[PDB]
Amino acid sequence: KARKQEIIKTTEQLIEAVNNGDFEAYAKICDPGLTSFEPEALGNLVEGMDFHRFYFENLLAKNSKPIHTTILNPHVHVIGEDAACIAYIRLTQYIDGQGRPRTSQSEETRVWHRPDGKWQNVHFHCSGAPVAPLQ
Amino acid sequence: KARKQEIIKTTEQLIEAVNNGDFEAYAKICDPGLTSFEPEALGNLVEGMDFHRFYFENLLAKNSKPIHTTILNPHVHVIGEDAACIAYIRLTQYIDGQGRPRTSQSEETRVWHRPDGKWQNVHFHCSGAPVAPLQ
Amino acid sequence: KARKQEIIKTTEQLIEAVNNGDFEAYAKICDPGLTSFEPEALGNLVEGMDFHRFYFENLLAKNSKPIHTTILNPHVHVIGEDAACIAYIRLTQYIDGQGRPRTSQSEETRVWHRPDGKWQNVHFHCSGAPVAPLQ
Amino acid sequence: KARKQEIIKTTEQLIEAVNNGDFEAYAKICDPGLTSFEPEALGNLVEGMDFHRFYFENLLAKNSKPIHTTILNPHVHVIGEDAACIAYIRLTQYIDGQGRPRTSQSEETRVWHRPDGKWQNVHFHCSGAPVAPLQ
Amino acid sequence: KARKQEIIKTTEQLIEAVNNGDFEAYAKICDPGLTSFEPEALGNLVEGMDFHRFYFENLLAKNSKPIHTTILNPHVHVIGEDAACIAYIRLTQYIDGQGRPRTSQSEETRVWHRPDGKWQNVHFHCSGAPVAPLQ
Amino acid sequence: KARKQEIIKTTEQLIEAVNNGDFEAYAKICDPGLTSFEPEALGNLVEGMDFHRFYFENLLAKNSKPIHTTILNPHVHVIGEDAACIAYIRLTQYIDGQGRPRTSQSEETRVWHRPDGKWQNVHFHCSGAPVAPLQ
Amino acid sequence: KARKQEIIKTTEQLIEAVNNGDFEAYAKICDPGLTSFEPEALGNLVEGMDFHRFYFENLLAKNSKPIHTTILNPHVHVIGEDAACIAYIRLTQYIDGQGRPRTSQSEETRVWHRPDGKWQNVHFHCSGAPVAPLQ
Amino acid sequence: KARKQEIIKTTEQLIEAVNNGDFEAYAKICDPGLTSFEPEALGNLVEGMDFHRFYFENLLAKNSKPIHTTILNPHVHVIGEDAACIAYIRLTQYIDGQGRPRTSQSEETRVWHRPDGKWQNVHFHCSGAPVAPLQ
Amino acid sequence: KARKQEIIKTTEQLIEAVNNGDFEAYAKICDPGLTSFEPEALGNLVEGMDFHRFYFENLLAKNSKPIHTTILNPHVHVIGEDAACIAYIRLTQYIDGQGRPRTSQSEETRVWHRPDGKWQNVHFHCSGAPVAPLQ
Amino acid sequence: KARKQEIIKTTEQLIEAVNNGDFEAYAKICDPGLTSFEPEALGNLVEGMDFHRFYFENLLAKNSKPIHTTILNPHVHVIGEDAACIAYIRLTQYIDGQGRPRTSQSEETRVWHRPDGKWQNVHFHCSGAPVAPLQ
Amino acid sequence: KARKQEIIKTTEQLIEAVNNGDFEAYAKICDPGLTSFEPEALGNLVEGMDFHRFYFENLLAKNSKPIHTTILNPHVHVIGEDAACIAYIRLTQYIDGQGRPRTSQSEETRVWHRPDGKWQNVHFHCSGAPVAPLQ
Amino acid sequence: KARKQEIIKTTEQLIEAVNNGDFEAYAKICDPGLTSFEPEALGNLVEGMDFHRFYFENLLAKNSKPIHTTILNPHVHVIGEDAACIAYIRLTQYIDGQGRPRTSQSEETRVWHRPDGKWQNVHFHCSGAPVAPLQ
């Protein structure tokens, strides 16, 4: 029951890092063997860090607008000493190009591995809208 | 090599059972704590086996019309000893109500746990089209 | 903590009783001075029991077609010692007129009162889709 | 009978404070454990104050264009000594972007609780249009 | 304040009489010099009692299906000692030709005069949907 | 019999003042406890004078386009000595925002009371087009 | 004056013949050099005016199933002292083919020559919607 | 003969005064007691020339383009020494804001009066185009 | 030189075989390890004979209507002694379900291998419209 | 053996040159008078490397912009000893002129031959899109 | 077979002349009676060479930069000993006024005659696809 | 001079024969080695009579609706002794789907050869609208 919290704490740290656009923190946690599905990939399974490395240098470079992100009803499933999974729903708020505020919803999955006592992410699934809000 | 093979073996068997409509085989493999994302849930994190039992007794009792399911390029990780993850793309061939062939795509994720003796599925995630064709 | 339980138990009983069309049972939980917003009222605050009595002779009596009701993540506030407020989301499954499955979502609110050693309902707010299934 | 009045007076104060785009007065009433269903939440249940704070910083107070708010036929229950619920309809008048008058209708619910000599809100349900009018 | 109750009681009696198709009861209260607006006149100010006699032999002779009538928030003015005005909303519940229920809304006005110790109706104005339900 | 004329004289002045855009005249004739049905109320029953003050300040006061109004075949009932009911039809000819002439129809009802020796309106009904000009 | 009533009575007599619905009576009233037109006649303007015959057939074919009639707000001009012009708006109520009651409207222009026992007409233009505006 | 000619001549004079906007002559030909059915009104019996005046003062101030008209199939009959009927189809020729060739059409009636030796029109029936078209 | 001929004959024979649905011949020429791009694959590389087997077993077998083909400007290379490539443009004629005439266009590439003295196709690449006829 | 790594070096070298304006690499690998399918010619079978020479030397050697190329699950067949066939899917990452990142999907094919030991590509086929993306 | 090639080169030089001052030589080589019809002519007889250059002028108006063109699968007949006709398809690669690469396709015909031992073009005909909407 | 006449006469005979769908006659005039361009070929150099044979069974066989064909501004070149060229304008009239005649224009160019003592067509280049009428 204690581990669940630190798993959720780690997930929050990861989401915060990607939002702030620090490639260093993302690289530290993400296992180079990471595999992910995103709408950015047009529905093709993608592997490796290089694919995401592009966005940290040209997309989030403009991440200056006011946004807010909420995490709803996280569910953590424990399957072993160094294995765990987490699922949750994600709500984000932002301001569109018309000056109005907008909201979007997306559900996500992540699988965590602990080699050498340190958690790392080895999978990622995003459904619905793209991670970056549409404006 | 060996373990990566049989994870695919079980996944193939599970996909076969759901297509055939056999409730017992699906019940055996699936873990009691199973969660799921899928379009049938309108974006909610459904849990348990009660929700899916509705479909088996009513809709999938018939598999008359032709259908062909294919799995392309599976990727499997092994976590620790008794945990693994599998990601793959699925192609479904079916005939529509107008009697013409039609193909649909969907990418899916799964997390497998083996407590002591039998592999079991604890989480699921289907993005895009539903688990069955739109006939 | 136990108080938060019997409320959810009662709410589950009331929803079950409505789905079975047994008006007699529904007349005990509900306080005579009931009020409610629901789509059937066209956005007007209805009061009393006579309004709902109509449905319990023609429509809900014929409520025999297969259906499944799910309650997701209820939340309860305990006010004072003899009152409470509960909110939740509701998922319904039904077979439409085309022989296909469907799902509908609607959130709800309820206020419970405890005079005379029993729990009773004194308000009800339903958004989104109608309470009854759309077969 | 007097207690049935100050609840209405308090509700009017809260609506005015929201309309003026002031946050300090808003916090002094709303309970820290507030929950609410609003269209801005896309049908989910949102807890806490942090979610609403975003709106008060970018949208409400920026223009304050001419508008009028009307409350019709409030209905109030008195539960115990420190609990009450209120239901009402709300008509709003505003000028659209085309320079023409418009109207919009919505119904709302609230639950009040008074620990330590102060009425405080713990639940809020809004159907139809959201709290903010569609200008 | 005493007069208001009897006026409302009279109005309810009148609505009951028309529903049951008793022309004699309708005539006993309504003043012979009655005018009325309603969709049945296509927007023409009708006058006299002959026009409405047509409905009490061919329209209500056919329709006998179950129906329920509700009256909401009646308001009454007193502008003398033998004259009064009443305004209210009305909701009707009826079953259409598909074997399913539906609701209709209309708002109405009436003017009452009291010659010979008896209240009499002199005007009527049904807005929105017509007086009768559309099955 | 002459009273049937002065009522029409007052009604004509009331409509003229409404069209012109001055608020003082409308206030004097209209009783403070005035009710009203009109499309701008979205089918609800409004009370008081403030609901219209918004219209006068923004739209009517700024009316600067040619339009025409006519009254066809009024009917007047005299009840008591200080009360009477008037019904009539209203054809409005207006130059639209496109600088083109167009016609629309609407029927109305008004109830008149004369305390202290001045006639005043206590109730108002309108159908079809809105009370305000359709420019 | 009195002669205004006489023409009114004769108009009812013409109506009486119309319910009988015999074309010979129609020919009797019409002057052999009468005029009439309508676009539904493709603008044809002849004494026969078969377009009148067209909706004479449709309307009067209903008479096997009972009908009722009504007229409103007649207006009369006496030409010199030897001819009379009469106009009005006519309401008719009928049972349709589906068994539902109906109402129909028809404006009318008629002119009658003084000579007693030989009254005849030179013109008529039903116009408006002689049969049905929009079904 | 001479009679029938001058009515037609007058008929044209009336038409020219319309297009030229010579209201004073139009007022001279038309009896102040004129009455008319025409689509400009929604089936009502307008009285006087004020309703038509709108189609002269504020319309012709900007509605002025080279325009022509053709009179088709006149047919007249005489009644007594001061009464007669004239019926005619009218074409109006001008190009609107579309490249398609254009020719509008109207068909009309007049009933004629000669008090004191000067002819005048007392009743007027129409259909199709208004007194003046859009430009 | 003749080698560039026989290859073209083989490709023409293959096209005829698939047109007539002779599964055996198609299997004989097609290598067991065939790859393929085509519109039906939604841009996914599909290997083996099972994927195409669906068309023969379901559609082509039942389909008995005729078909005709046009092949334009083939270019063939020569590599080694058991390899070759062919590129060309294609135009095809057939009959639909309604029987009305239908002609299709496609542009296709193929690669051939000749081990064991028998020419066999190991790769294929279509474009544009679907390979299968649209009946 | 070691063919998959062979294509890695060979295909990488070809792709790198393609993304650059140099023609030496393109000329050396390609085969003179070779057909190739690219949407640049609308399936006109661009013959000879000279077609690509014109654009690469003159225009396409523009200023580079941040772009990224990806290759997914390539498949290789080895024909005889001096030939091979390769298929794969190419995802292109680029930033459009609006300043927003974008991705595109396009599948390809290539046939390789070893003339006198050194490898040479004697065919090329691009589907879905051309070699280069559009900004 | 040689005579089939000389025609091609004569045409190849002639086509290249369009891009140089040799266009006058192209004019000189052709019969002064040279004539052609073009898709956009719709009755405008042209000298053949002029209209084709006019297309080239349009491209150079946008381009005014160096050009490359290609000719594919030429077809040449042999008629008599002093006549011949050629058919071919032409592609042009150019840089647009926006600086981006572009391509165009054309279909051409030419008639050749050799009096006095000099090949003279006596009839030309081009073909493109400039459909009117939006190019 | 006389040689010019027969060229036009034969072309008329071929065109008329084309209109009548008499494929056998068309097969005689046209040389077996016919080359042609046309919209149906999508800008491709078709060869042989097989492609054209299709139209003479489905489309040209049903050519029974009224049609009119005209020849304008014919011009003929005489090359050598057994060759000649013909160019002209073409106008076709036909009844469209709306039942209104339509006019279409199309320009051609042909080359005739005279072996065996008879004229035959060895080229054809149609532009603009298709050969067949667009009914």
Author numbering:
A (entry chain B), B (entry chain I), C (entry chain N), D (entry chain D), E (entry chain K), F (entry chain G), ...: 408 to 542
Sentences from the paper on this structure:
The calcium calmodulin protein kinase II (CaMKII) is a multi-subunit ring assembly with a central hub formed by the association domains. The AD hub, which evolved from bacterial dimeric enzymes, extends the β sheet to form lateral contact interfaces (LCs) needed for ring assembly, while the ancient dimer contact was preserved as the vertical contact interface (VC) in the mirror-symmetric two-stack hub. Linkers with variable length and sequence between isoforms and developmental splice variants, connect each AD with a peripheral kinase domain (KD). Here, we present near-atomic resolution cryogenic electron microscopy (cryo-EM) structures revealing that hubs from the α and β isoforms, either standalone or within an β holoenzyme, coexist as 12 and 14 subunit assemblies.
In order to determine activation-independent effects, we engineered a CaMKIIβ holoenzyme construct with alanine substitutions at both activation (T287) and inhibitory (T306.T307) phosphorylation sites, the βT287.306-307A holoenzyme. The T287A substitution blocks activation and aids R attachment to the KD core, while the T306-307A substitutions countered the dissociation reported for human α hubs by the addition of R peptides phosphorylated at these sites. We obtained three cryo-EM reconstructions from the engineered β holoenzyme sample: a 14-mer (3.0 Å resolution), a 12-mer open ring (3.5 Å resolution), and a close 12-mer (8.4 Å resolution). In addition to the polymorphic hub structures, we obtained an open hub structure lacking one dimer from the β holoenzyme sample. The open ring structure is the first near-atomic resolution structure of an intermediate CaMKII hub assembly. It has 12 ADs but a diameter similar to the 14-mer ring. The ADs adjacent to the opening are blurred in the top view 2D class averages with lower local resolutions. The vertical dimer on the right of the opening shifts 14.6° down off-plane. We utilized the 3D-flex refinement algorithm for analysis of the motion in the open 12-mer cryo-EM dataset. The analysis indicated that the dominant collective motions are the enlargement of the gap by 5–10 Å due to weakened LCs between the adjacent ADs.
